[PDB]
Amino acid sequence: GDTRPRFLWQLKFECHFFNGTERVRLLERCIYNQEESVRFDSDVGEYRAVTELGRPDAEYWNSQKDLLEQRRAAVDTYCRHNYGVGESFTVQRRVEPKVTVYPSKTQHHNLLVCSVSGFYPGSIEVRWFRNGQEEKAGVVSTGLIQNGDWTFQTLVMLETVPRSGEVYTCQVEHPSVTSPLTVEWRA
Amino acid sequence: EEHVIIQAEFYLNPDQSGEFMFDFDGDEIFHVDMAKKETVWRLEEFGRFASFEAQGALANIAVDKANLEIMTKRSNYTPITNVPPEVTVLTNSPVELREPNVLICFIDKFTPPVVNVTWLRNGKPVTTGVSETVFLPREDHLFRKFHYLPFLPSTEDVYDCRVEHWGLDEPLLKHWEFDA
């Protein structure tokens, strides 16, 4: 078998946006195997070594203003530029979530499941209500799952002690819709 | 914070593999084909709204190699510590018999970025319809990756996402069958 050791090199230019394109932070990072050696934080304004392995580079690059100028100006020419380039289909991309409620195949008490899938973006708010009022306790989430195809899914359970007549609602709040989505479970 | 666009690249020795891709809030926008030297978009649609001079990524990757050599040498050739992947198999949406659905094999938190993935339907490899993504960056510098198998739910079938990675002592088979 292949036993030769590997040597990896990674480079990441991360553009962080806050309030649209109001405040931008560029984070340039070099990673040797699984450790970040050098980096450029636009907030700092120059390279800083993250490990001694990175010192030669931080010191070296910082000795070239032509270079640093380009880098300082990147929050604009690079970050904001790219942001706008794909804002129509990324920042503004919206896909309504499919919601359905059905009892779990587990669980006396009845375990209710609220499946919310195929939605985008990821910020989503799902809550359980009982006869019109929030249900803080009992809830259990699967967490937000990223499918890798610009689509998200999640499951939110709600343990209950059902009574004929009761109504348990799974409310969903998401950017793709103006008013919240609701799916009730008639007890 | 609201959004993060990441340009992620890497070069690996001695497999001499490389990657160059952009990422939006976790999702891949596109990556360059090092062989065909052309931009391939995560979603066909994007290619109609923007472009990228693919040919240019190859240059960064060249510098990337040179850089790896340098680092490799000044670290006294400290090899990479393999980290086995967390593997999970889920459905694209809630499953219901004969209702077409997609199996997603989540390969997460691993390194180096070299892995072998195979789909198994009743102990036998499935090919048709399957698709996979390139390597996705992680805050901890390990990788993510997704493999896809569209299928037709049934009671009789049992699938496996067979994963191979150096950090694993033996092939890992994540079992998945209809249980609803």
């Binding site: 030669p56 380039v85 | 340009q7 472009s51 990228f52 510098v63």
Partner: peptide, 13 residues
Amino acid sequence: PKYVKQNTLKLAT
């Protein structure tokens, strides 16, 4: 609209 890249710098030698 065109995506632009950041050029990779060469390490200190």
